[PDB]
Amino acid sequence: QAYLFFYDKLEKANYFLDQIVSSADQDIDSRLVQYLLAAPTEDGGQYSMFLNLVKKYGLIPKDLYGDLPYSTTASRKWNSLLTTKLREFAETLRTALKERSADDSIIVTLREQMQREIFRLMSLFMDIPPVQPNEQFTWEYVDKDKKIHTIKSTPLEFASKYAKLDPSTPVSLINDPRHPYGKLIKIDRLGNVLGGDAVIYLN
Amino acid sequence: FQGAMSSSIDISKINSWNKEFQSDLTHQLATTVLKNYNADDALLNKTRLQKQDNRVFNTVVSCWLFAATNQLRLNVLSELNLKEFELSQAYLFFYDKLEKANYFLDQIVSSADQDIDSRLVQYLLAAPTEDGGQYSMFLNLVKKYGLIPKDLYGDLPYSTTASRKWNSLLTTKLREFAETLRTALKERSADDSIIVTLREQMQREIFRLMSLFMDIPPVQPNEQFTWEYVDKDKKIHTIKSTPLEFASKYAKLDPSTPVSLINDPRHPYGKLIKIDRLGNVLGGDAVIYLNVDNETLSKLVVKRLQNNKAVFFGSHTPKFMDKKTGVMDIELWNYPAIGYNLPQQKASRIRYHESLMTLAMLITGCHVDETSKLPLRYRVENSWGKDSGKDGLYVMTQKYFEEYCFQIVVDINELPKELASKFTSGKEEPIVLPIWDPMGALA
Amino acid sequence: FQGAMSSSIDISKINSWNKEFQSDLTHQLATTVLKNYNADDALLNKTRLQKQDNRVFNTVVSCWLFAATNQLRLNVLSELNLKEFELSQAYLFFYDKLEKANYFLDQIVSSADQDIDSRLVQYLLAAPTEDGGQYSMFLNLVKKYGLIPKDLYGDLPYSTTASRKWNSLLTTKLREFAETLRTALKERSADDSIIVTLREQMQREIFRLMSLFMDIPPVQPNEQFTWEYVDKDKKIHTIKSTPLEFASKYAKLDPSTPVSLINDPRHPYGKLIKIDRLGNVLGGDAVIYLNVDNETLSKLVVKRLQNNKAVFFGSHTPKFMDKKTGVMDIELWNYPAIGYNLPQQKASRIRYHESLMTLAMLITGCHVDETSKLPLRYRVENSWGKDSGKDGLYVMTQKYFEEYCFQIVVDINELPKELASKFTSGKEEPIVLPIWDPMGALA
């Protein structure tokens, strides 16, 4: 679970930076901006967000990446330190955006230094997973019969070949009396992986 | 495409950075320790603790409800020569909650014109009856209800200590009433007979539910109560008085003298600041602050203390506060040792949702640079008991005061005529902030 | 003078060094964390833990008293088809303590010639009846007393679990007897009538005090006992046997096959090593080890395991052992991150009072480099229960085995004729070490 938790938090933080740039035009005291500054890296999530993570990172057996780190069970402190920094970065960005354009060289550099800094702080409470999504890992295990086996696979292939996950089949329905039935419902801006799928429900 | 790509998390990038951080010894040590322990517990700096934990103060006196009533408590204690004494907090808590709920109904009617999904309405539905409050709200309660000794109205009821459940049931009902009102307002006018009746039935229902968790106080504000007590000498006495007279004659409270100042870098100093719609008793006073610089703020704290009176103040608890040792020092934890530094300034911290007032406490002392200078540290007290801090006492640095404290309350007579007139002129137009401003209610 | 001065602690020196260490970021972080937490708790490396905590073993079987009897326990379990079974540890514990105390009296007589303040005598008076032991000592007990099911002699007595008090009272008496003997030996000869009587009264007194904390076992070694039990099938059975026959016929123990090897870098390999005077049953076998290199030692562990038998082994507990996670890895704690490195090698560690055998455990499995190589990790089990380690199981690295383990016990028939002959030739003269050698008794 920690595997996904790590990338979810790293992605949300990065996504937040983008949300701030795309709303740089609105006032700091606006409804959207204040809302963005409220809880940038909360642990919550949705199913589409789960799929956005799995399509990009895959899955791995817990044996290779457990819940050993303190923050994996008591993330409140960690999240708080991260958020305090994201609030500083938000000002740094907005400020730099008053004079420079978004695609401007300076901004692009600034955003990269922020990703760097986010990742650095995160690596202090959790290690980046041991293998990259397309990198092979070797897993030793014992089956029901006490017979030992070795599996060599990558996180992505594993999620697919062994976990049998097909990201195209899952869809979520919802009973939301506020709107007509048979209509599709979309939650604006809600996400984790920049450019990932949106939160969609069929009412 | 290029921009969106540059803004995505690149796996090669983070793994390359990881490789670089891992070749740094400080980082290797930092992630060993930080995967094992809470950053605050791991980084608490005992070397700094050693020099900052100083409990000597050369200027000393001889949650929001406790902090606001403490002085009045002292007044009674001295006026009647008692060994111990306590004002009923529950008395004010009961009326504060009943008033807030009623006030909420009014807020809903006055905003019936805006959509349900609007910023103000949604905000109103969020936490209609939270326990927090401000000093002006305390005065609004005391002017209407007075004060009573704790002996006549204690914290016996369950909900007086665990109000969360109760508050929740109340709020669920207030949310139902909000719809009932708004709905009835689509066709009828506010002053319309039907609405007025509807609102009264709601007050009734609120009071009924409240009476289930707490009893209405035993006497009305102008109703006499008789209080039997024992003074320091074991000699018994009987006092016959009403809540209002008591707050005045024995507690010595004059609602016209207290004024609160604040250090809010977002706005010019010398200007008055008003929090829109924030209140409890319908038609009561508004939350008003006179914005001022820190030097002035610090000097006022010293003067009040030299006048032998503790100082009500609002701060951002528990930022940089160590409850175990009772220290409030923004440098007590060695975060820079792990490359964690915080450059964002006070004004920005506020605008960017990073700092706000969350709690009211009391400054009961301070230490001034006896050379020819100014305050270095303050003695702070809360109502958590001898358990919190050192026997309940805290020590706060001057720098912490400047950076994570905002408001203090003083008597207008202790202010320079220059600032006093800000409250008495009538020429000052206040800067008006939204009801959700970070500089609002204190727990 | 110059030399003594250069060897003194110079205040300017240490404060100058401090200044230099303080300007190093890793050091600043290290002393922040280390003033707050235990070095082991602070430096435990979870990144290393993650990869080393592997509970997969391709070679598996299907405190000193528990480890030495476990196999015999298994033998009975299989021989009688029981769901569960346990040999009495208390049985051996009783006679071990009684024998050691008696043996001590003999040690004192045989060294009566040396001064009281001598190295050997003072050493003898130190801990005459400690609970530790060796494998040869286990055999000396079994050859004389046999074995019995726990059901007939359990750990009911208080002292069987908290022997410290009891041992202390016994030792105080043994110290009194030591003087009484030595004194009587200044004038009389050892074989002198008086001495012989005196020694018998002492045995009597030892046994009397021991019988107060534990009962002598219910049957004598050649005395038949009747044991009622239930097999896996709920079917009841009665076994009539004596302790000696039982240890042999049901436990299948042959005292002639077990031999112990050891990796002691202080001496040449291929040579036999003997611990002088170390024993329990007067006239019993001595503690003997065949010194061998680690490759050989590791291979023997594999072979025993492939023969489906756990392996008794002595190591330095709890060096580099994490009880909470059940891991024995000398690199599990990131000490080099704080500049703490340990270059001293095994042979030196032993000679310099840094490492010794302290505890006996069992190797119940291992993982071999299935390519074409050798063992990588071993499965280890102790008798502390499911609480210690992971459900009581530990995982030990190959490197830990090489560095902080020393002795293993195998059957002479599993040894290469080359090494087997070392025990059967009769030509080998053993290297003789003092009774206080770090390679002695195991707890």
Q: How would you sum up the global shape of chain A?
A: globular
DSSP strand content of chain A: 5-15%
Q: Work out the helix count of chain A.
A: 6
Biggest β-sheet: strands ordered side by side in the sheet of chain A: 1-2
Which chains share the greatest interface? Answer: A-B, 48 and 38 residues
The chain-level structural class of chain A is mainly alpha
User: In angstroms, what separates the terminal alpha carbons of chain A?
Assistant: 30 Å
Family (chain A): Belongs to the peptidase C1 family.
Subunit structure (chain A): Homohexamer. Binds to nucleic acids. Binds single-stranded DNA and RNA with higher affinity than double-stranded DNA.
Organism (chain A): Saccharomyces cerevisiae (strain ATCC 204508 / S288c) (Baker's yeast)
Protein name (chain A): Cysteine proteinase 1, mitochondrial
